[PDB]
C-alpha cells in the first residue's frame, strides 16, 4: 500500500476536470480555464508524482477510478500502464495503484460533475459522452513517451483519438481541444510514414460548423508535423497558406504552431515570413518546463534570422547555458560576417551531425548564399559607390562578374538593394534621404496605427473576461 | 595597497603584453604578503597566461615561484586564519561594544591581504553597527569590499558594496568617499560597463588619498581614458588640457591628451598616432576588462562625428589626407559604424566625393522614430497574443 498513490492522483485530476467541463457547457469561461491548464496541471502531474511511494505516476489512477468504463482508448492505454489482462510496457504497482484489483480505494466520493467510476458504467445516456472520453484520453497520452512505452500505444492515439470526438458540441470540442495537444508533443517525437491524416482532416471540417475555434487550432499543429515526418514540402505548403490561425487556444500550443511553421517556410527561401514566427515562438514558450523544446527552437532561430541578411547577436548564443551546442551556430554567424566561404563550408560538415539532430540542417545548406550576400549589402549600404573589384577581394569571390550576379538575383527581391553600373564598373546604391517634404511618412505611420487598432478593441475586450469568470465562479 | 596586485595581474592578461609580465606580477606578493590573493587571482583569470610556480607550469610562463615565497605564503595565510578563529571565539563572551569591534579590526588589514572570503563574511559585518570614530568605520568597510573584487564573483561584490553605501554619508568624510568611487568603478568595468564606471571615476580625480589605493599617477591616467569612452570631445578635452590636470601632475597624461587634442584642432593626423600609445599604456594593464572595443570604437566614431557635423559634402581626398590612414582602411572602419547606426554618412568612392546626412530638423528624427518603433511594434504583436490567451 501507499496512501500517496490514491489520495493525490485521484483528487488533483478531479477538481480540475469537473470545474472545466461543467463551466464550459454553462458559459464561455475559456480564458480562465487555459491559464489553469498549461502551468498548474501539467507541472504537478509530471514532476512530483514520479517520486512518491511507488514507481512513476502521472495521473493514471483517475483513468482507473473515475474511468466510467467508456468506449474510448483511455481504458486500452490504461491496461498497459497497469495490468488488467496484459502487463504492457510498464509494470503495475501493488502499492494501491492496481488495475488487477479494480474497485480499490477512492477518496472522491459521489458527485456526478466530479466523475465517479462505480456510480455508472456507461456515459451513453446523454451528450456528455465525447467530453469525458476526451478528458480521460488526455491524461493518458502525455505519460506514454514519458515512461518509455512504445509500439501499439502511440498509434492508437493518432487514428483512434480522432474517432472519439468528431461529432461534438461547443463544450465537447473544448475539452477535446486539450486532448489533441498533449497528443501533439508525443507525435513530433516519433516519425511515421503511416497516414493518420484521413480522420484528422474529415473531423476538422465538421467541427468548424459545430462551434469551437480551439479544436481547430490544435489539429492544424498536429497535421504540420505529419507532413514533417513524410518530409514532403508540397503538402505542408498547402496547409500553411490556407490557415491564418486564430487566437483561442493556449500559449504553449501557439509556440508549437509558430516553430513548425517557421521551420518549413525558410527552405524555399522565405526567410522573411519565417523569422517573424520563430522570434514569436521563443518568446511564447513557458518557463522551466519548456526548456527542452526551447533549446531546439533557439538553434533554428539563429539560422532563420541569419538567412534574412541579418547577422544575429553573439550574446544570445552565449546566455541560455546551451552555449556549447550554440557554439557552431555562432561560428556560422561569424563566417557570414567575414564573407569567407572556406570557414562556412568546413563548419557545416563538422557540426553537420549535431545540426541534423536539431532538424536545422536543411536550412543550413541555404545559408551558403548568405555568407557572400550579407557582406556585399553591408558594404554597399555603408559606402554607396564602391568598385566591382573591391567587393570581389573582400568576400573571396571569383570575379567582378561573380559579385554582379549576386546583385542581380537580389535586386528584384530587394535585399542588397543596389544596382550595377558597368559604365566604369561600380555598384551604386539607390539610397537618398529627405522624406519629410513628401507625403510618404504619413503612410508609414498610417499602417502602423491601423495594425495597432484592431488589437486595441481586442485589448479592452479580453481584459475584463477573466476576472468576471472568477466572480461568476462560486468561491469559499 | 592590495589594489596594486590587480593592476599588475592585468599586465600578463592583456594582448599588448604577455610572457615577461609574470616575473613582475610575482614580486608584489612576497613583498606585501598578498600571496593568498595572487594564488586566488589565477583561478579568477581562468587561463589567459598566468600561474608562475615551480609547483606547476614551470616553463609555461617561463617564470616560477620561489621556495621562500612558498613557505611565506603558507605562513602568512595560516597565521591570519589562526588568529581569526580564536578572536571570533574570545570576542563573543566579553563586551559587545569594545571587544568584538577591536578583534575584527585587528584581523582586517591582514584578512583582506589574503583575500579569504569565508573568514571575512562573518567577521566583517559585526564591527560596523556600533558607533565609534566615524572615519574609522568607513576605512574598515573598504577592506571587506577588496576581497570580493579578487574573485570576480558578481554576487559577493554587490553584497559588499551595500554596507559601505549606508556608512559613507554617515561619516561624511569626503576623502573616504572618494575611495568607495574607485571600488564601484572597478566592479562596473568588470560586468562590461565603462560608461557607469566613468561617471564615478571623474569625481575621484579632485581629492585623492593614496592609502588603500595604488598611486595617484596611475589613477589620473585611468580617469581621463575611462571618461573619454563615456563623454564626447567638447567637455572632456576642455577639462584635461585647459584645466588643472596636466600642469599639477607634471606630465603623465600625454598619451590620452594627444588622442582628444586632434579632434579639437581638426587635425586627425595626430589622432591616428595617439591610438597605439594610449592602448598599451593607459587602457591595458587591467584585470577587470582589457577590452579595447568599447574604448576604440567610441573614439573612432567621435573623430568622424565632428567632421560630419561641420560639412554637408566633403571629398574623400580631404578625408584621407586629414586622418592620414588609407582610403581603404577609412572605408572599412566606417562600415561597422554606419551599419550599427552610430553614424550616417556614405563615401561614393569611385568618384571621390562623400555625401553626409545632417543631424538637424525633423527628418533625421523621423528616421529615428521609425527605428525604435519597429522593435517596439514587434514586441507588441507577441505581447497581444500571449496576454489574451
Amino acid at each position: 500500500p501507499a496512501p500517496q498513490d490514491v489520495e493525490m492522483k485521484e483528487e488533483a485530476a478531479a477538481g480540475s476536470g469537473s470545474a472545466g467541463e461543467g463551466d464550459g457547457k454553462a458559459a464561455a469561461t475559456e480564458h480562465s480555464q487555459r491559464e489553469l491548464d498549461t502551468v498548474t496541471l501539467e507541472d504537478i502531474k509530471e514532476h512530483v508524482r514520479q517520486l512518491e511511494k511507488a514507481v512513476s505516476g502521472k495521473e493514471p489512477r483517475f483513468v482507473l477510478r473515475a474511468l466510467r468504463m467508456l468506449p474510448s482508448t483511455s481504458r486500452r492505454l490504461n491496461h498497459y500502464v497497469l495490468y488488467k489482462a496484459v502487463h504492457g510496457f510498464f509494470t503495475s504497482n501493488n502499492a494501491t495503484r492496481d488495475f488487477l484489483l479494480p474497485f480499490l480505494e477512492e477518496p472522491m466520493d459521489t458527485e456526478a460533475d466530479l466523475q465517479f467510476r462505480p456510480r455508472t458504467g456507461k456515459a451513453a445516456s446523454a451528450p456528455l459522452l465525447p467530453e469525458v472520453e476526451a478528458y480521460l484520453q488526455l491524461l493518458m497520452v502525455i505519460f506514454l513517451m514519458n515512461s518509455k512505452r512504445y509500439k501499439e500505444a502511440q498509434k492508437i492515439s493518432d487514428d483512434l483519438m480522432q474517432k472519439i470526438s468528431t461529432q461534438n458540441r461547443r463544450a465537447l470540442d473544448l475539452v477535446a481541444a486539450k486532448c489533441y495537444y498533449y497528443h501533439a508533443r508525443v507525435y513530433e517525437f516519433l516519425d511515421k510514414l503511416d497516414v493518420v491524416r484521413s480522420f484528422l482532416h474529415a473531423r476538422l471540417r465538421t467541427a468548424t460548423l459545430r462551434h469551437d475555434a480551439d479544436g481547430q487550432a490544435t489539429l492544424l499543429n498536429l497535421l504540420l508535423r505529419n507532413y514533417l515526418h513524410y518530409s514532403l514540402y508540397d503538402q505542408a505548403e498547402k496547409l500553411v497558406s490556407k490557415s491564418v490561425f486564430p487566437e483561442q487556444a493556449n500559449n504553449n500550443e501557439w509556440a508549437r504552431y509558430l516553430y513548425y511553421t517557421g521551420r518549413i517556410k525558410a527552405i524555399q527561401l522565405e526567410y522573411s515570413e519565417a523569422r517573424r514566427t520563430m522570434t514569436n515562438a521563443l518568446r511564447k514558450a513557458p518557463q522551466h518546463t519548456a526548456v527542452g523544446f526551447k533549446q531546439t527552437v533557439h538553434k533554428l532561430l539563429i539560422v532563420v534570422e541569419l538567412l534574412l541578411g541579418e547577422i544575429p547577436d553573439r550574446l544570445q548564443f552565449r546566455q541560455p547555458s546551451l552555449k556549447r551546442s550554440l557554439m557552431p551556430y555562432f561560428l556560422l554567424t561569424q563566417a557570414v560576417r567575414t564573407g569567407n566561404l572556406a570557414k562556412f563550408n568546413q563548419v557545416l560538415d563538422q557540426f553537420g551531425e549535431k545540426f541534423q539532430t536539431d532538424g536545422t540542417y536543411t536550412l543550413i545548406i541555404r545559408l551558403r548564399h548568405n555568407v557572400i550576400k550579407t557582406g556585399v549589402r553591408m558594404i554597399s549600404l555603408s559606402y554607396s559607390r564602391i568598385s566591382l573589384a573591391d567587393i570581389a577581394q573582400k568576400l573571396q569571390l571569383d570575379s567582378p562578374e561573380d559579385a554582379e550576379f549576386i546583385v542581380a538575383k537580389a535586386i528584384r527581391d530587394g535585399v542588397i538593394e543596389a544596382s550595377i553600373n558597368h559604365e566604369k564598373g561600380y555598384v551604386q546604391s539607390k539610397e537618398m534621404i529627405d522624406i519629410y517634404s513628401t507625403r510618404e511618412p504619413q503612410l508609414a505611420f498610417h499602417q502602423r496605427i491601423s495594425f495597432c487598432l484592431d488589437i486595441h478593441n481586442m485589448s479592452v475586450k479580453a481584459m475584463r473576461f477573466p476576472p468576471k469568470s472568477y466572480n461568476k465562479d462560486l468561491e469559499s | 595597497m592590495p589594489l596594486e596586485n590587480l593592476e599588475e595581474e592585468g599586465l600578463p592578461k592583456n594582448p599588448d603584453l604577455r610572457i615577461a609580465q609574470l616575473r613582475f606580477l610575482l614580486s608584489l606578493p612576497e613583498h606585501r604578503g598578498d600571496t593568498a590573493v595572487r594564488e586566488e587571482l589565477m583561478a579568477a583569470v581562468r587561463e589567459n597566461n598566468m600561474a608562475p610556480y615551480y609547483e606547476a607550469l614551470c616553463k609555461s610562463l617561463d617564470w616560477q615561484m620561489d621556495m621562500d615565497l612558498l613557505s611565506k605564503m603558507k605562513k602568512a595565510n595560516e597565521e591570519e586564519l589562526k588568529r581569526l578563529d580564536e578572536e571570533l571565539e574570545d570576542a563573543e563572551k566579553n563586551l559587545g561594544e569594545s571587544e568584538i569591534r577591536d578583534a575584527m579590526m585587528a584581523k582586517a588589514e591582514y584578512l583582506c591581504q589574503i583575500g579569504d572570503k569565508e573568514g571575512a563574511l562573518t567577521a566583517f559585518r559585526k564591527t560596523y553597527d556600533k558607533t565609534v570614530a566615524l572615519g574609522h568605520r568607513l576605512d574598515i568597510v573598504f577592506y571587506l569590499l577588496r576581497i570580493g573584487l579578487f574573485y570576480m564573483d558578481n554576487d559577493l561584490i554587490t553584497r559588499n558594496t551595500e554596507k559601505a553605501k549606508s556608512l559613507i554619508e554617515e561619516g561624511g568624510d569626503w576623502d573616504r568617499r572618494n575611495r568607495l568611487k574607485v571600488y564601484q568603478g572597478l566592479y562596473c568595468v568588470a560586468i562590461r560597463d565603462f560608461k557607469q564606471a566613468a561617471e564615478l571615476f571623474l569625481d575621484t580625480v579632485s581629492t585623492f588619498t593614496s592609502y588603500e589605493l595604488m598611486d595617484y599617477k596611475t589613477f589620473v591616467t585611468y580617469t581621463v581614458y575611462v571618461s573619454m569612452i563615456a563623454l564626447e570631445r567638447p567637455d572632456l578635452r576642455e577639462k584635461v588640457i585647459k584645466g588643472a590636470e596636466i600642469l599639477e601632475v607634471l606630465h603623465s597624461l600625454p598619451a590620452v591628451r594627444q588622442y582628444l587634442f586632434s579632434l579639437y584642432e581638426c587635425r586627425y593626423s595626430v589622432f591616428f598616432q595617439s591610438l597605439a600609445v594610449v592602448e598599451q599604456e593607459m587602457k591595458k594593464d587591467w584585470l577587470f576588462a582589457p577590452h579595447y572595443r568599447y574604448y576604440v570604437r567610441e573614439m573612432r566614431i567621435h573623430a568622424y562625428s565632428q567632421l560630419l557635423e561641420s560639412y554637408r559634402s566633403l571629398t574623400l581626398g580631404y578625408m584621407a589626407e586629414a586622418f592620414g590612414v588609407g582610403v581603404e582602411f577609412i572605408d572599412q572602419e566606417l562600415s561597422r559604424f554606419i551599419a550599427a547606426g552610430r553614424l550616417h554618412c556614405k563615401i561614393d568612392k569611385v568618384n571621390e566625393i562623400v555625401e553626409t546626412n545632417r543631424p538637424d530638423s525633423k527628418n533625421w528624427q523621423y528616421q529615428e522614430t521609425i527605428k525604435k518603433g519597429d522593435l517596439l511594434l514587434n514586441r507588441v504583436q507577441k505581447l497581444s497574443r500571449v496576454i489574451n490567451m
Binding site: - | 594582448p15 591616428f272 592602448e279 582589457p290 592620414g324
Partner: peptide, 24 residues
C-alpha cells in the same frame, strides 16, 4: 557587433603602415 579588440590589433598595425606613406 562587439568582441572587436582582437581584429582591432591587426587593424592598428596595418593602418600605421598605410598612415606613414600617405600622410600630409
Amino acid at each position: 557587433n562587439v568582441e572587436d579588440d582582437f581584429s582591432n590589433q591587426l587593424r592598428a598595425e596595418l593602418e600605421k603602415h598605410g598612415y606613414k606613406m600617405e600622410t600630409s
